[model samples]
Target: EGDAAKGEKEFNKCKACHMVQAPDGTDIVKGGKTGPNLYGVVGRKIASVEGFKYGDGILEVAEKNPDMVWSEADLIEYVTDPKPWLVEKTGDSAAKTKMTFKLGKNQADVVAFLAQHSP
Candidate 1:
């Protein structure tokens, strides 16, 4: 498990684009209404968040690899750069994803947090 406290502290940067809350509440701090809710992302199936309308690129990736799961390593790569992953996974550059916030120094912390919270 990751350092939950450090991850919580690192989550401050994410507030600008996302919220770490249960899905039952209002969808504020949402990801452009473009990305899916990232609450329980760890171990989750790719593009399988209920009610989230994923882009064609992500959907294509999901369809092709329904068993695609989010491991810590996968999350690290995904969080680092979604574009390349999408392009590599789906072979499309204009996938129209909802994620825009890029993690800087806090990438590890945020990843830790997600692992702690979702795992």
Candidate 2:
């Protein structure tokens, strides 16, 4: 089990690109839109956020794994290095990603925090 308290602090790095607002317009962590709203992303389907235009590579992975939902492990792997994960998942070495920011470590803690906000 990772530390949610530490994850909350680590989330500062992600807040520049992401937010954790609730569905009712409550701002859990008001932030930029450079990335998607990460609220409830833990149990959501990959690339299935309403009107968010996902990248082709990630979309391909989503298409390939239609039934796959975002879990803590999934979030950890993707946040660590999205490009390589997409390449492996989509079987396209040239697969790209818009998420350039990678969490070099403590990804588990981030995932834990995200999981907490999911419900």
Candidate 3:
């Protein structure tokens, strides 16, 4: 298993765009809105966050998956490189992503941390 403790610190990089706040406005990791709020991301729907404009590429993937939830496995791969991940999932080589940042490494740990507030 990945280290949640380390993931908490690693989350510093993601705070620039995402936040891990709860539904009641609790701050798991108060962050910017450049990206979507990541609270309960684990087990959440893919690209289903309302009031957010998701990239066409990821929206297509979500359409294809239909019943897919944000599992640790998929999240690890997606966060590593959003473009390639989108291309792979949507089967469209020209797929684009709004998430410009890539965690690349230490991904499992990051997801591990995200899992904490998810439950």
TM-score of each: 0.76, 0.96, 0.97
On lDDT, the stronger of 1 and 2 is 2
Evaluated against the true structure, the overall lDDT of model 3 is 0.91
Tens-place lDDT per residue, model 2, 1-119, is: 78888888999999998999999999989999988999999999999988887889999988888899997888899999898889889888889788878899999998888888999
lDDT (Cα atoms) of all candidates against the true structure? 0.69, 0.89, 0.91
Local accuracy of candidate 1 as per-residue lDDT tens digits, 55-78 = 677778888898888878777777
lDDT of 3 by residue, 13-119 (tens): 99988999999998889999988999889999999899999989989988898999998999999889888889888788999799869897799999999998788
Worst 10 residues of 1 by lDDT: 26-35
Greater TM-score among 1 and 3 belongs to 3
Worst 10 residues of 2 by lDDT: 93-102
**92 Cα displacement, candidate 1 (Å):** 2.5
TM-score of candidate 3 relative to the true fold: 0.97
Better of 1 and 3 by lDDT: 3
CA shift of 111, model 2, Å: 0.7
